[PDB]
Amino acid sequence: DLDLAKASATDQLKKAKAEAQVIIEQANKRRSQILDEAKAEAEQERTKIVAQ
Amino acid sequence: AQAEIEAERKRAREELRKQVAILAVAGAEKIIERSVDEAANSDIVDKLVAEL
């Protein structure tokens, strides 16, 4: 049972690791979402304040 | 965008004062053209030689 503990522990760490690795990807994408939103609302604003 | 607006204001003031300068010196020439006078002209000669 020593190696039951050993193996289950190693794979359980790896699952925590992968769960982090996918917690990061959503983070990167959400950044892209909100940052491109800011880019759009910046250009669309500039290009009419200046027209005014 | 605000910087760009201010830059356009500067640019337009300058390109306006250019027009007025052009017409100003052309008009001053048209003024000399008929205020010119043998007595005043000889006075110009006198003053420039006296300064020579």
Side-chain angles (χ1 to χ4, degrees), chain A residues 13-30:
Chain A
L13 288 190
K14 298 302 124 299
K15 310 340 301 162
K17 198 147 286 205
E19 292 158 52
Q21 211 60 220
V22 297
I23 289 157
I24 284 158
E25 310 320 45
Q26 329 143 349
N28 299 344
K29 290 178 180 166
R30 293 182 183 174

Side-chain angles (χ1 to χ4, degrees), chain A residues 46 49-51, chain B residues 1-2 4-5:
Chain A
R46 185 263 294 288
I49 174 58
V50 304
Chain B
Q2 293 294 306
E4 203 276 359
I5 294 314

